[PDB]
Amino acid sequence: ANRFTANIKGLTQAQRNANDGISLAQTTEGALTEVNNNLQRIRELSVQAA
Amino acid sequence: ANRFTANIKGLTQAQRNANDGISLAQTTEGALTEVNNNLQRIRELSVQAA
């Protein structure tokens, strides 16, 4: 029983760490979204200037 | 979807470039009309002098 209760808490904390990783991925995704939009604008201006 | 968007945006401005071309072509013709009208009269005057 000692070993069962020794094993439980680790898994709990692991769930916490997974949540943190989720959040990290989301923030990076948003940044890349903005970069994408700017490159689209550059494309259109370059065909303007052609 | 991104590569569909890119070409839609490019084509739309490519559509305006053609209008520029049509306008240029149209403008030159009005100039040439008067040149023609002057040559027509020069020939006829030269007929009178023979």
Coordinates of all heavy atoms in Angstrom, one line a residue:
Chain A
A1 N 0.8 -1.2 0.0 CA 0.0 0.0 0.0 C 0.9 1.3 0.0 O 0.5 2.2 -0.7 CB -0.9 0.0 1.2
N2 N 2.0 1.2 0.8 CA 2.9 2.3 0.7 C 3.4 2.6 -0.7 O 3.5 3.7 -1.1 CB 4.1 2.0 1.6 CG 5.0 3.2 1.9 OD1 4.8 4.3 1.2 ND2 5.9 3.1 2.8
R3 N 3.6 1.5 -1.5 CA 4.2 1.7 -2.8 C 3.1 2.3 -3.7 O 3.4 3.1 -4.6 CB 4.8 0.5 -3.3 CG 5.6 0.6 -4.5 CD 6.3 -0.7 -4.8 NE 7.2 -1.1 -3.7 CZ 7.0 -2.1 -3.0 NH1 6.0 -2.9 -3.2 NH2 7.8 -2.4 -2.0
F4 N 1.8 1.8 -3.6 CA 0.7 2.4 -4.3 C 0.6 3.9 -4.1 O 0.6 4.7 -5.1 CB -0.6 1.7 -4.0 CG -0.8 0.4 -4.7 CD1 -0.8 -0.8 -4.0 CD2 -1.2 0.4 -6.0 CE1 -1.1 -2.0 -4.6 CE2 -1.4 -0.8 -6.6 CZ -1.4 -2.0 -5.9
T5 N 0.6 4.3 -2.8 CA 0.4 5.7 -2.6 C 1.7 6.5 -2.9 O 1.6 7.7 -3.1 CB 0.1 5.9 -1.1 OG1 0.0 7.3 -0.8 CG2 1.1 5.3 -0.2
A6 N 2.8 5.8 -3.0 CA 4.0 6.5 -3.5 C 3.9 6.7 -5.0 O 4.5 7.6 -5.5 CB 5.3 5.7 -3.2
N7 N 3.2 5.9 -5.7 CA 3.1 6.0 -7.2 C 2.1 7.0 -7.6 O 2.2 7.6 -8.7 CB 2.8 4.6 -7.8 CG 3.4 4.5 -9.2 OD1 3.6 5.6 -9.8 ND2 3.6 3.3 -9.7
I8 N 1.0 7.2 -6.8 CA -0.1 8.0 -7.3 C 0.3 9.5 -7.6 O 0.0 10.1 -8.6 CB -1.2 8.0 -6.3 CG1 -1.8 6.6 -6.2 CG2 -2.3 9.0 -6.7 CD1 -3.1 6.6 -5.5
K9 N 1.0 10.1 -6.6 CA 1.2 11.5 -6.6 C 2.1 11.9 -7.8 O 1.9 13.0 -8.4 CB 1.9 11.9 -5.3 CG 1.1 11.3 -4.1 CD 1.7 11.8 -2.8 CE 0.8 11.3 -1.7 NZ 1.3 11.9 -0.4
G10 N 3.1 11.1 -8.2 CA 3.9 11.4 -9.3 C 3.0 11.5 -10.6 O 3.2 12.5 -11.4
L11 N 2.0 10.6 -10.8 CA 1.2 10.8 -11.9 C 0.4 12.0 -11.9 O 0.2 12.7 -12.9 CB 0.2 9.5 -12.0 CG 0.9 8.2 -12.2 CD1 0.0 7.1 -12.0 CD2 1.6 8.1 -13.6
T12 N -0.1 12.4 -10.7 CA -0.8 13.7 -10.6 C 0.1 14.9 -11.1 O -0.3 15.6 -12.0 CB -1.2 14.0 -9.2 OG1 -1.8 12.8 -8.6 CG2 -2.1 15.1 -9.1
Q13 N 1.3 14.9 -10.6 CA 2.2 16.0 -11.1 C 2.5 15.9 -12.6 O 2.6 17.0 -13.2 CB 3.5 16.0 -10.3 CG 4.2 17.3 -10.4 CD 3.4 18.5 -10.0 OE1 2.6 18.4 -9.1 NE2 3.6 19.5 -10.8
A14 N 2.5 14.7 -13.1 CA 2.8 14.6 -14.5 C 1.6 15.2 -15.3 O 1.8 15.8 -16.4 CB 3.0 13.1 -14.9
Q15 N 0.4 15.0 -14.9 CA -0.8 15.7 -15.5 C -0.5 17.2 -15.5 O -0.8 17.9 -16.6 CB -2.0 15.3 -14.8 CG -2.8 14.1 -15.4 CD -4.1 14.0 -14.7 OE1 -5.1 13.9 -15.5 NE2 -4.2 13.9 -13.4
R16 N -0.1 17.7 -14.4 CA 0.2 19.2 -14.4 C 1.2 19.6 -15.5 O 1.0 20.5 -16.2 CB 0.7 19.6 -13.0 CG 0.6 21.1 -12.8 CD -0.8 21.4 -12.4 NE -1.5 20.4 -11.6 CZ -1.5 20.5 -10.3 NH1 -0.9 21.5 -9.6 NH2 -2.1 19.5 -9.6
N17 N 2.3 18.8 -15.6 CA 3.4 19.2 -16.6 C 2.8 19.1 -18.0 O 3.1 20.0 -18.8 CB 4.6 18.3 -16.4 CG 5.1 18.2 -15.0 OD1 4.6 18.9 -14.2 ND2 6.2 17.5 -14.8
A18 N 2.0 18.1 -18.3 CA 1.4 18.1 -19.6 C 0.6 19.3 -19.9 O 0.6 19.9 -21.0 CB 0.5 16.8 -19.7
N19 N -0.2 19.8 -18.9 CA -1.0 21.0 -19.2 C -0.1 22.2 -19.5 O -0.4 23.0 -20.5 CB -1.8 21.4 -17.9 CG -3.0 20.5 -17.8 OD1 -3.1 19.7 -16.8 ND2 -3.9 20.6 -18.7
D20 N 1.0 22.3 -18.8 CA 2.0 23.4 -19.1 C 2.5 23.3 -20.6 O 2.5 24.3 -21.3 CB 3.2 23.4 -18.2 CG 2.7 23.6 -16.7 OD1 1.6 23.9 -16.5 OD2 3.6 23.4 -15.8
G21 N 2.8 22.1 -21.0 CA 3.3 21.9 -22.4 C 2.2 22.4 -23.4 O 2.5 23.0 -24.4
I22 N 0.9 22.0 -23.1 CA -0.1 22.4 -24.0 C -0.1 23.9 -24.2 O -0.2 24.5 -25.3 CB -1.5 22.0 -23.4 CG1 -1.7 20.5 -23.5 CG2 -2.6 22.7 -24.2 CD1 -3.0 20.0 -22.9
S23 N 0.0 24.7 -23.1 CA -0.1 26.1 -23.2 C 1.1 26.7 -24.0 O 0.9 27.6 -24.8 CB -0.1 26.7 -21.8 OG -1.1 26.1 -21.0
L24 N 2.3 26.1 -23.8 CA 3.4 26.6 -24.6 C 3.2 26.5 -26.1 O 3.4 27.4 -26.8 CB 4.6 25.8 -24.2 CG 5.8 25.9 -25.1 CD1 6.3 27.3 -25.2 CD2 6.9 25.0 -24.6
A25 N 2.7 25.3 -26.5 CA 2.4 25.1 -27.9 C 1.4 26.2 -28.4 O 1.6 26.7 -29.5 CB 1.9 23.7 -28.2
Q26 N 0.4 26.5 -27.7 CA -0.6 27.4 -28.1 C 0.0 28.8 -28.4 O -0.3 29.4 -29.5 CB -1.8 27.5 -27.1 CG -2.8 26.4 -27.2 CD -4.0 26.7 -26.5 OE1 -4.0 27.5 -25.5 NE2 -5.1 26.1 -26.9
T27 N 0.8 29.3 -27.5 CA 1.3 30.6 -27.6 C 2.2 30.7 -28.9 O 2.1 31.7 -29.7 CB 2.1 31.0 -26.4 OG1 1.3 30.9 -25.2 CG2 2.6 32.5 -26.5
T28 N 3.1 29.7 -29.1 CA 3.9 29.8 -30.3 C 3.1 29.7 -31.5 O 3.4 30.5 -32.5 CB 4.9 28.6 -30.2 OG1 5.8 28.8 -29.2 CG2 5.7 28.5 -31.5
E29 N 2.0 29.0 -31.6 CA 1.1 28.9 -32.7 C 0.6 30.3 -33.1 O 0.7 30.7 -34.3 CB 0.0 28.0 -32.5 CG -1.2 28.1 -33.4 CD -0.8 27.7 -34.9 OE1 -0.9 26.5 -35.2 OE2 -0.5 28.6 -35.6
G30 N 0.1 31.1 -32.1 CA -0.4 32.4 -32.4 C 0.6 33.3 -33.1 O 0.4 34.0 -34.1
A31 N 1.8 33.3 -32.5 CA 2.9 34.1 -33.1 C 3.1 33.8 -34.6 O 3.1 34.7 -35.5 CB 4.2 33.9 -32.3
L32 N 3.2 32.5 -34.9 CA 3.4 32.1 -36.3 C 2.3 32.6 -37.2 O 2.5 32.9 -38.4 CB 3.7 30.6 -36.5 CG 5.1 30.2 -36.3 CD1 5.9 30.8 -37.4 CD2 5.7 30.5 -35.0
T33 N 1.0 32.6 -36.6 CA -0.1 33.1 -37.4 C 0.2 34.5 -37.9 O 0.0 34.8 -39.1 CB -1.4 33.1 -36.6 OG1 -1.7 31.7 -36.3 CG2 -2.5 33.8 -37.3
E34 N 0.7 35.4 -37.0 CA 0.9 36.8 -37.5 C 2.0 36.9 -38.5 O 1.8 37.6 -39.5 CB 1.2 37.6 -36.3 CG 0.0 38.3 -35.7 CD -0.7 39.2 -36.7 OE1 -0.2 39.5 -37.8 OE2 -1.8 39.7 -36.4
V35 N 3.0 36.1 -38.4 CA 4.1 36.1 -39.4 C 3.5 35.7 -40.7 O 3.8 36.4 -41.8 CB 5.2 35.2 -39.0 CG1 6.2 35.0 -40.1 CG2 5.9 35.7 -37.8
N36 N 2.7 34.7 -40.8 CA 2.1 34.3 -42.0 C 1.3 35.4 -42.7 O 1.5 35.6 -43.9 CB 1.1 33.1 -41.7 CG 0.4 32.6 -43.0 OD1 0.7 33.0 -44.1 ND2 -0.6 31.8 -42.8
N37 N 0.5 36.1 -42.0 CA -0.3 37.2 -42.6 C 0.6 38.2 -43.3 O 0.4 38.7 -44.4 CB -1.2 37.8 -41.6 CG -2.6 37.2 -41.6 OD1 -3.2 37.1 -42.6 ND2 -3.0 36.7 -40.4
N38 N 1.7 38.6 -42.6 CA 2.6 39.6 -43.2 C 3.2 39.1 -44.5 O 3.3 39.8 -45.5 CB 3.7 40.0 -42.2 CG 3.2 41.1 -41.3 OD1 3.0 42.2 -41.7 ND2 3.0 40.8 -40.0
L39 N 3.6 37.8 -44.5 CA 4.2 37.3 -45.8 C 3.2 37.3 -46.9 O 3.5 37.6 -48.1 CB 4.7 35.9 -45.6 CG 6.0 35.8 -44.7 CD1 6.4 34.4 -44.5 CD2 7.1 36.5 -45.5
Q40 N 1.9 37.0 -46.6 CA 0.9 37.2 -47.7 C 0.9 38.6 -48.3 O 0.8 38.8 -49.5 CB -0.5 36.8 -47.1 CG -0.6 35.4 -46.7 CD -0.8 34.4 -47.8 OE1 -1.0 34.9 -48.9 NE2 -0.8 33.2 -47.5
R41 N 0.9 39.6 -47.4 CA 0.9 40.9 -47.9 C 2.1 41.2 -48.8 O 2.0 41.9 -49.8 CB 0.8 41.9 -46.7 CG 0.8 43.4 -47.1 CD -0.5 43.7 -47.9 NE -0.7 45.1 -48.0 CZ -1.5 45.7 -48.9 NH1 -2.1 44.9 -49.8 NH2 -1.6 47.0 -48.9
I42 N 3.2 40.7 -48.4 CA 4.4 41.0 -49.2 C 4.3 40.4 -50.6 O 4.6 41.0 -51.6 CB 5.7 40.4 -48.5 CG1 6.0 41.1 -47.2 CG2 6.9 40.4 -49.4 CD1 6.6 42.5 -47.4
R43 N 3.7 39.2 -50.7 CA 3.5 38.5 -52.0 C 2.6 39.4 -52.9 O 3.0 39.7 -54.0 CB 2.8 37.2 -51.7 CG 2.3 36.2 -52.8 CD 3.5 35.6 -53.5 NE 3.1 34.5 -54.4 CZ 2.7 34.7 -55.7 NH1 2.7 35.9 -56.2 NH2 2.3 33.7 -56.4
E44 N 1.5 39.9 -52.3 CA 0.6 40.8 -53.2 C 1.3 42.0 -53.6 O 1.2 42.5 -54.8 CB -0.6 41.1 -52.4 CG -1.5 42.1 -53.1 CD -2.6 42.6 -52.2 OE1 -3.6 41.9 -52.1 OE2 -2.5 43.7 -51.6
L45 N 2.1 42.7 -52.7 CA 2.8 43.9 -53.1 C 3.8 43.6 -54.2 O 4.0 44.5 -55.1 CB 3.4 44.6 -52.0 CG 2.6 45.6 -51.1 CD1 2.2 46.7 -52.0 CD2 1.4 44.9 -50.5
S46 N 4.5 42.5 -54.2 CA 5.5 42.2 -55.2 C 4.8 41.9 -56.5 O 5.5 42.2 -57.6 CB 6.3 41.0 -54.7 OG 7.4 40.8 -55.6
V47 N 3.6 41.4 -56.6 CA 3.0 41.3 -57.9 C 2.4 42.7 -58.3 O 2.4 43.0 -59.5 CB 1.9 40.2 -57.9 CG1 0.7 40.6 -57.1 CG2 1.4 40.0 -59.3
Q48 N 2.1 43.5 -57.4 CA 1.8 44.9 -57.7 C 3.0 45.6 -58.5 O 2.8 46.2 -59.5 CB 1.6 45.7 -56.4 CG 1.5 47.3 -56.5 CD 0.2 47.8 -57.1 OE1 -0.9 47.3 -56.9 NE2 0.3 48.9 -57.9
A49 N 4.2 45.4 -57.9 CA 5.3 46.1 -58.5 C 5.9 45.4 -59.7 O 7.1 45.6 -60.0 CB 6.4 46.2 -57.4
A50 N 5.2 44.6 -60.4 CA 5.8 43.7 -61.4 C 5.7 44.3 -62.8 O 6.5 44.0 -63.7 CB 5.2 42.3 -61.4
Chain B
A1 N -5.4 25.2 -48.1 CA -6.3 26.4 -48.1 C -5.4 27.6 -48.2 O -5.7 28.6 -48.9 CB -7.1 26.5 -46.8
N2 N -4.2 27.6 -47.5 CA -3.3 28.7 -47.6 C -2.8 28.9 -49.1 O -2.7 30.1 -49.5 CB -2.1 28.5 -46.7 CG -1.4 29.7 -46.2 OD1 -1.7 30.8 -46.8 ND2 -0.6 29.6 -45.2
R3 N -2.5 27.9 -49.8 CA -2.0 28.0 -51.1 C -3.2 28.4 -52.1 O -2.9 28.8 -53.2 CB -1.3 26.8 -51.6 CG 0.2 26.9 -51.4 CD 0.9 25.8 -52.1 NE 0.4 24.5 -51.7 CZ 0.8 23.8 -50.6 NH1 1.6 24.4 -49.8 NH2 0.3 22.7 -50.3
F4 N -4.4 28.1 -51.7 CA -5.5 28.6 -52.5 C -5.6 30.2 -52.3 O -5.8 30.9 -53.3 CB -6.8 28.0 -52.1 CG -7.1 26.7 -52.7 CD1 -7.4 25.6 -51.9 CD2 -7.1 26.5 -54.0 CE1 -7.7 24.3 -52.4 CE2 -7.3 25.2 -54.6 CZ -7.6 24.2 -53.8
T5 N -5.5 30.6 -51.1 CA -5.6 32.0 -50.8 C -4.5 32.8 -51.5 O -4.7 33.9 -52.0 CB -5.4 32.2 -49.3 OG1 -6.5 31.6 -48.6 CG2 -5.5 33.7 -48.9
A6 N -3.3 32.3 -51.5 CA -2.2 33.0 -52.1 C -2.5 33.3 -53.6 O -2.3 34.5 -54.0 CB -0.9 32.2 -52.0
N7 N -3.0 32.3 -54.3 CA -3.2 32.5 -55.7 C -4.4 33.4 -56.0 O -4.4 34.2 -56.9 CB -3.3 31.2 -56.4 CG -2.0 30.6 -56.8 OD1 -1.1 31.4 -57.2 ND2 -1.9 29.3 -56.7
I8 N -5.4 33.3 -55.1 CA -6.6 34.2 -55.3 C -6.1 35.7 -55.2 O -6.4 36.5 -56.0 CB -7.7 33.9 -54.2 CG1 -8.3 32.6 -54.5 CG2 -8.7 35.0 -54.2 CD1 -9.3 32.2 -53.5
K9 N -5.3 36.0 -54.1 CA -4.9 37.3 -53.9 C -4.0 37.8 -55.1 O -4.1 38.9 -55.6 CB -4.1 37.5 -52.6 CG -5.0 37.3 -51.4 CD -4.2 37.6 -50.2 CE -5.1 37.4 -49.0 NZ -6.2 38.4 -48.9
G10 N -3.1 36.9 -55.6 CA -2.2 37.3 -56.7 C -3.1 37.6 -57.9 O -2.9 38.7 -58.6
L11 N -4.0 36.7 -58.3 CA -4.8 36.9 -59.5 C -5.6 38.2 -59.5 O -5.7 38.8 -60.5 CB -5.7 35.7 -59.7 CG -5.0 34.4 -60.2 CD1 -6.1 33.4 -60.4 CD2 -4.4 34.8 -61.5
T12 N -6.1 38.6 -58.3 CA -6.9 39.7 -58.3 C -6.2 41.0 -58.8 O -6.7 41.8 -59.5 CB -7.5 40.0 -56.9 OG1 -8.3 38.9 -56.5 CG2 -8.3 41.2 -56.9
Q13 N -4.9 41.1 -58.4 CA -4.2 42.3 -58.8 C -3.7 42.1 -60.2 O -3.6 43.1 -61.0 CB -3.0 42.5 -57.9 CG -2.1 43.7 -58.3 CD -2.7 45.0 -57.8 OE1 -3.2 45.1 -56.7 NE2 -2.7 46.0 -58.7
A14 N -3.4 40.9 -60.6 CA -3.1 40.6 -62.0 C -4.2 41.1 -62.9 O -4.0 41.4 -64.1 CB -2.8 39.2 -62.2
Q15 N -5.4 41.1 -62.4 CA -6.6 41.5 -63.1 C -6.6 43.0 -63.4 O -7.1 43.5 -64.4 CB -7.9 41.1 -62.4 CG -9.1 41.2 -63.2 CD -10.2 40.3 -62.7 OE1 -10.1 39.8 -61.6 NE2 -11.2 40.0 -63.5
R16 N -6.0 43.8 -62.5 CA -5.9 45.2 -62.6 C -4.9 45.6 -63.6 O -5.0 46.6 -64.4 CB -5.7 45.9 -61.3 CG -6.6 47.1 -61.0 CD -6.3 47.6 -59.6 NE -6.8 46.7 -58.6 CZ -8.0 46.6 -58.3 NH1 -9.0 47.3 -58.9 NH2 -8.4 45.7 -57.3
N17 N -3.8 44.8 -63.7 CA -2.7 45.2 -64.6 C -3.2 45.2 -66.0 O -2.8 46.0 -66.9 CB -1.5 44.2 -64.4 CG -0.9 44.3 -63.1 OD1 -1.4 45.0 -62.2 ND2 0.2 43.6 -62.9
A18 N -4.1 44.3 -66.4 CA -4.6 44.2 -67.7 C -5.4 45.5 -68.0 O -5.3 46.0 -69.2 CB -5.5 43.0 -67.9
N19 N -6.1 46.0 -67.0 CA -6.9 47.3 -67.3 C -5.9 48.4 -67.5 O -6.2 49.3 -68.4 CB -7.7 47.6 -66.0 CG -9.1 46.9 -66.1 OD1 -9.6 46.6 -67.2 ND2 -9.8 46.8 -65.0
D20 N -4.8 48.4 -66.8 CA -3.8 49.4 -67.2 C -3.4 49.3 -68.6 O -3.3 50.3 -69.4 CB -2.6 49.3 -66.3 CG -2.8 49.6 -64.8 OD1 -4.0 50.0 -64.5 OD2 -1.9 49.6 -64.0
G21 N -3.1 48.1 -69.1 CA -2.7 47.9 -70.5 C -3.8 48.4 -71.5 O -3.5 49.0 -72.5
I22 N -5.0 48.0 -71.2 CA -6.1 48.5 -72.1 C -6.2 50.0 -72.2 O -6.4 50.6 -73.3 CB -7.5 47.9 -71.7 CG1 -7.4 46.5 -71.4 CG2 -8.5 48.2 -72.7 CD1 -8.7 46.0 -70.7
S23 N -6.0 50.6 -71.1 CA -6.1 52.1 -71.0 C -5.0 52.7 -71.9 O -5.2 53.6 -72.6 CB -6.0 52.6 -69.6 OG -7.0 51.9 -68.8
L24 N -3.7 52.2 -71.7 CA -2.6 52.7 -72.5 C -2.9 52.6 -74.0 O -2.8 53.5 -74.8 CB -1.3 52.0 -72.1 CG 0.0 52.4 -72.8 CD1 1.1 52.1 -71.8 CD2 0.2 51.5 -74.0
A25 N -3.3 51.4 -74.4 CA -3.6 51.1 -75.8 C -4.7 52.1 -76.3 O -4.6 52.7 -77.4 CB -4.0 49.7 -76.0
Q26 N -5.7 52.3 -75.5 CA -6.8 53.2 -75.9 C -6.3 54.6 -76.1 O -6.7 55.3 -77.1 CB -7.9 53.1 -74.9 CG -9.2 53.7 -75.3 CD -10.4 53.2 -74.5 OE1 -11.0 52.2 -74.9 NE2 -10.7 53.8 -73.4
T27 N -5.5 55.1 -75.2 CA -5.0 56.5 -75.3 C -4.2 56.7 -76.6 O -4.3 57.8 -77.2 CB -4.2 56.8 -74.1 OG1 -5.1 56.9 -72.9 CG2 -3.5 58.2 -74.3
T28 N -3.4 55.8 -77.0 CA -2.6 56.0 -78.2 C -3.4 56.3 -79.5 O -3.0 57.1 -80.3 CB -1.6 54.9 -78.4 OG1 -0.6 54.9 -77.3 CG2 -0.8 55.1 -79.7
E29 N -4.5 55.6 -79.6 CA -5.3 55.7 -80.8 C -5.9 57.1 -81.1 O -5.9 57.6 -82.2 CB -6.5 54.7 -80.7 CG -7.4 54.7 -81.9 CD -6.7 54.1 -83.1 OE1 -5.7 53.4 -83.0 OE2 -7.1 54.5 -84.3
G30 N -6.3 57.8 -80.0 CA -6.8 59.1 -80.2 C -5.8 60.0 -80.7 O -6.0 60.9 -81.5
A31 N -4.5 59.8 -80.3 CA -3.4 60.6 -80.9 C -3.3 60.3 -82.3 O -3.0 61.3 -83.1 CB -2.1 60.3 -80.1
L32 N -3.3 59.1 -82.8 CA -3.0 58.7 -84.2 C -4.1 59.3 -85.1 O -3.8 59.5 -86.3 CB -2.8 57.3 -84.3 CG -1.4 56.9 -84.0 CD1 -1.2 55.5 -83.8 CD2 -0.5 57.4 -85.1
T33 N -5.3 59.4 -84.6 CA -6.4 59.8 -85.5 C -6.1 61.2 -86.2 O -6.2 61.3 -87.4 CB -7.7 60.0 -84.7 OG1 -8.1 58.7 -84.3 CG2 -8.8 60.6 -85.6
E34 N -5.6 62.1 -85.4 CA -5.3 63.5 -85.9 C -4.2 63.5 -86.9 O -4.2 64.3 -87.9 CB -5.0 64.5 -84.8 CG -6.2 64.7 -84.0 CD -7.3 65.5 -84.7 OE1 -6.9 66.3 -85.6 OE2 -8.5 65.3 -84.4
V35 N -3.1 62.7 -86.7 CA -2.1 62.5 -87.7 C -2.7 62.1 -89.0 O -2.3 62.6 -90.1 CB -1.0 61.5 -87.2 CG1 0.0 61.3 -88.2 CG2 -0.5 61.9 -85.9
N36 N -3.6 61.1 -89.0 CA -4.2 60.6 -90.2 C -4.9 61.8 -90.9 O -4.8 62.0 -92.1 CB -5.1 59.5 -89.9 CG -5.7 58.8 -91.1 OD1 -5.6 59.4 -92.2 ND2 -6.3 57.7 -91.0
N37 N -5.7 62.5 -90.1 CA -6.5 63.6 -90.6 C -5.7 64.6 -91.3 O -6.1 65.3 -92.2 CB -7.4 64.2 -89.6 CG -8.8 63.5 -89.5 OD1 -9.6 63.7 -90.3 ND2 -9.0 62.6 -88.5
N38 N -4.5 64.9 -90.8 CA -3.6 65.9 -91.4 C -3.0 65.4 -92.7 O -2.9 66.1 -93.7 CB -2.5 66.3 -90.4 CG -2.9 67.4 -89.5 OD1 -2.8 68.6 -89.8 ND2 -3.4 67.0 -88.3
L39 N -2.6 64.1 -92.7 CA -2.0 63.6 -94.0 C -3.0 63.6 -95.1 O -2.7 63.8 -96.3 CB -1.5 62.2 -93.7 CG -0.1 62.1 -93.1 CD1 0.1 60.8 -92.4 CD2 1.0 62.3 -94.2
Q40 N -4.3 63.2 -94.8 CA -5.4 63.3 -95.8 C -5.4 64.6 -96.5 O -5.6 64.7 -97.7 CB -6.7 63.0 -95.1 CG -6.9 61.6 -94.5 CD -6.8 60.5 -95.6 OE1 -7.3 60.7 -96.7 NE2 -6.3 59.4 -95.2
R41 N -5.3 65.7 -95.7 CA -5.4 67.0 -96.3 C -4.1 67.4 -97.1 O -4.2 68.1 -98.1 CB -5.7 68.0 -95.3 CG -5.6 69.5 -95.7 CD -6.7 69.8 -96.7 NE -6.9 71.3 -96.8 CZ -7.6 71.9 -97.7 NH1 -8.1 71.2 -98.7 NH2 -7.7 73.2 -97.7
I42 N -3.0 67.0 -96.6 CA -1.7 67.3 -97.3 C -1.8 66.7 -98.7 O -1.4 67.4 -99.7 CB -0.5 66.8 -96.6 CG1 -0.2 67.8 -95.4 CG2 0.7 66.8 -97.5 CD1 1.1 67.4 -94.8
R43 N -2.2 65.4 -98.8 CA -2.2 64.8 -100.2 C -3.1 65.6 -101.1 O -2.8 65.9 -102.3 CB -2.7 63.4 -100.1 CG -2.3 62.5 -101.2 CD -3.3 61.4 -101.5 NE -2.9 60.4 -102.4 CZ -3.2 60.4 -103.7 NH1 -4.0 61.2 -104.2 NH2 -2.7 59.4 -104.4
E44 N -4.3 66.0 -100.6 CA -5.3 66.7 -101.5 C -4.7 68.0 -101.9 O -4.9 68.5 -103.1 CB -6.6 66.8 -100.8 CG -7.7 67.3 -101.7 CD -7.7 68.8 -101.8 OE1 -7.3 69.4 -100.8 OE2 -8.1 69.3 -102.9
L45 N -4.1 68.8 -101.0 CA -3.5 70.0 -101.4 C -2.4 69.8 -102.5 O -2.3 70.6 -103.4 CB -2.9 70.8 -100.2 CG -3.8 71.6 -99.3 CD1 -3.1 71.9 -98.1 CD2 -4.2 72.8 -100.1
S46 N -1.6 68.8 -102.3 CA -0.6 68.5 -103.3 C -1.2 68.2 -104.7 O -0.6 68.4 -105.7 CB 0.3 67.4 -102.9 OG 1.2 67.1 -103.9
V47 N -2.4 67.6 -104.7 CA -3.1 67.4 -106.0 C -3.4 68.7 -106.7 O -3.3 68.8 -107.9 CB -4.4 66.7 -105.8 CG1 -5.2 66.6 -107.1 CG2 -4.1 65.3 -105.2
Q48 N -3.7 69.8 -105.9 CA -4.0 71.1 -106.5 C -2.8 71.7 -107.2 O -3.0 72.5 -108.2 CB -4.7 72.0 -105.5 CG -4.9 73.4 -106.0 CD -5.8 74.2 -105.1 OE1 -6.1 73.8 -103.9 NE2 -6.2 75.4 -105.5
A49 N -1.6 71.4 -106.7 CA -0.5 72.2 -107.2 C 0.1 71.6 -108.5 O 1.1 72.1 -108.9 CB 0.6 72.2 -106.1
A50 N -0.4 70.5 -109.0 CA 0.2 69.9 -110.2 C -0.3 70.4 -111.5 O 0.3 70.2 -112.5 CB -0.1 68.4 -110.2

